């Protein structure tokens, strides 16, 4: 069996040059509707597993350069809930860059309040990739459709959170068409969907692309703006309105809870509401308003149901060749702090999913590291001589990258850059 291999200096230089980050991405909602008895109410927005990153293509080359078929070198995936061995459903990635798991269910036999999705991944040639977990999802029995309030609620929508919208045509399961943005065009694709920031805007604002944002939880009858997370193509101002029984209700000050059938209204646009005509989104009339001025009869294809969504991301790279040990513990670093100065210049790393088999790398320099806990690690900053040979002391600020390396050589990427602080005096703490 292949033993652990310490990451060398020139391999780190090669990583700094190429940067083939094999990033793994998971989009999934934060709320799951529970199923009772033997029912099977699926998650309306299917968990979407993306595989962004150029380095993935490199992984296609190296393995195929060692005698592997296109079927053997393709990573098969499994989706499941962790605490129960109720078999992991299969995900296939034949010629796609992503996939959605639309056949998942949660029975009432599991009395957990929260859970989290588990994704096993391995190549066809039995080479394991590992188990990646997504952010937590809350179980719900029925959406809080009553007149909730802000006092103790926390399942409503905050301005600036990733949300998603979908449709259901006459209680048909296959008729679900999700809101997506691609090619600078808003699609109603029944196969893809992105993360949508929703910003509460003041009643008096500007035309677009420049506005005064507003804080606070989002209620009905307000003015909101939807912005795709990746494309950035925004929509003009809209007004969310709760609907039921093909009738739109506008005079409502209730908060926007989860799994709500809302409607969007354009200012000074009569009754033209954003609806879907099969494959594309179009504005629809919805004329009748006879019972009350606050009751507009809106046709089908309009029960846009809203649901919040999070985003899990785990990026890494194999700097010392593929190893037998799975890369299922992916460390994340949320912030980096300082601990001393001079000869005892240490750094405190605050993150999540840390492993004791990890060592910090200040660019291309291996430093002494201590494992405090699974979310906190201390390290010793090396001398400036490792970067500038002739320099006895730090002369001018030097910006190096900070990364994490496992014993086997799996290099993990961070987004924080260390900066050597320049020192006026020469020799520090001479003794």
């Amino acid at each position: 069996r292949p033993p652990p291999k310490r990451l060398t200096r020139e391999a780190m230089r090669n990583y700094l040059k190429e940067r083939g980050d094999q990033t793994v991405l998971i989009l999934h909602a934060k709320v799951a509707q529970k199923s009772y008895g033997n029912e099977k109410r699926f998650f309306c927005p299917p968990p979407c597993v993306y595989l962004m990153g150029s380095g993935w293509k490199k992984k296609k080359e190296q393995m195929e350069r060692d005698g592997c078929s296109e079927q053997e070198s393709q990573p098969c995936a499994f989706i499941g809930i962790g605490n129960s061995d109720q078999e992991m459903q299969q995900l296939n990635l034949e010629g796609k860059n992503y996939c959605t798991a639309k056949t998942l269910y949660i029975s009432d036999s599991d009395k957990r309040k929260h859970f989290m999705l588990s994704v096993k991944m391995f190549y066809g040639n039995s080479d394991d990739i590992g188990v990646f977990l997504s952010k937590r999802i809350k179980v719900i029995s029925k959406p809080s459709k009553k007149k909730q309030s802000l006092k103790n609620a926390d399942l409503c929508i905050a301005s600036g959170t990733k949300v998603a919208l979908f449709n259901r045509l006459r209680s048909q399961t296959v008729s679900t068409r999700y809101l997506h943005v691609e090619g600078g065009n808003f699609h109603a694709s029944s196969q893809q969907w992105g993360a949508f920031f929703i910003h509460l805007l003041d009643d008096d604002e500007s035309e677009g692309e420049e506005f005064t944002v507003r804080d606070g939880y989002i209620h009905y009858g307000q003015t909101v703006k939807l912005v795709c997370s990746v494309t950035g193509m925004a929509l003009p101002r809209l007004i969310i309105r709760k609907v039921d029984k093909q009738t739109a209700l506008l005079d409502a000050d209730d908060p926007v809870s989860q799994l709500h059938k809302c409607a969007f209204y354009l200012k000074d646009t009569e009754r033209m509401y954003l609806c879907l005509s099969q494959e594309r989104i179009i504005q629809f009339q919805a004329t009748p308003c006879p019972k009350e001025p606050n009751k507009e009869m809106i046709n089908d294809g309009a029960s846009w149901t809203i649901i919040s969504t999070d985003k899990a991301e785990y990026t890494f790279y194999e700097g010392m060749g593929p190893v037998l040990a799975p890369v299922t513990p992916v460390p994340v670093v949320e912030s980096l702090q300082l601990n001393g100065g001079g000869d005892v210049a240490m750094l405190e790393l605050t993150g999540q999913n840390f492993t004791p088999n990890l060592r910090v790398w200040f660019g291309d320099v291996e430093a002494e590291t201590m494992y405090r806990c699974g979310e906190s690690m201390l390290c010793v900053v090396p001398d400036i001589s490792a970067f500038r040979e002739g320099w006895r002391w730090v002369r001018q600020p030097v910006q190096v990258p900070v990364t994490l390396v496992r014993n086997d050589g799996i290099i993990y990427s961070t987004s924080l850059t260390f900066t050597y602080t320049p020192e006026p005096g020469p020799r520090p703490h001479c003794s």
Binding site: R395, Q396, P422, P424, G425, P426
Partner: protein, 95 residues
């Protein structure tokens, strides 16, 4: 040419008599504030050494006090880091 590399090599001897001699006759090259090998003038490395007579003679002969060395620090920073209290006196008095 050869007279320019004299101060950068004579200040590393901590000799006040030789400095006063080579500066009484003065010079024509007008080296004055001269950035040394580390980009530090004779003033800066004289503060590094920690002798008040050398820095005082330098300030006497037109050596500007409020100049930043090659790396960006003034004459006061090195005096504050070295701990020599007598240097900051004349660095503040000259303002």
């Amino acid at each position: 040419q050869t007279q320019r590399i004299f101060q950068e090599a004579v200040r590393k001897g901590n000799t006040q008599e030789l400095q006063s001699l080579l500066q009484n006759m003065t010079n024509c090259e007008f080296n004055v504030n001269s950035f040394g090998p580390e980009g530090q003038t004779a003033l800066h490395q004289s503060v590094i050494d920690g002798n008040l007579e050398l820095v005082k003679l330098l300030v006497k002969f037109g050596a500007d006090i409020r100049l930043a060395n090659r790396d960006g620090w003034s004459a006061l920073h090195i005096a504050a880091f070295g701990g020599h209290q007598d240097i900051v006196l004349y660095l503040i008095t000259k303002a």
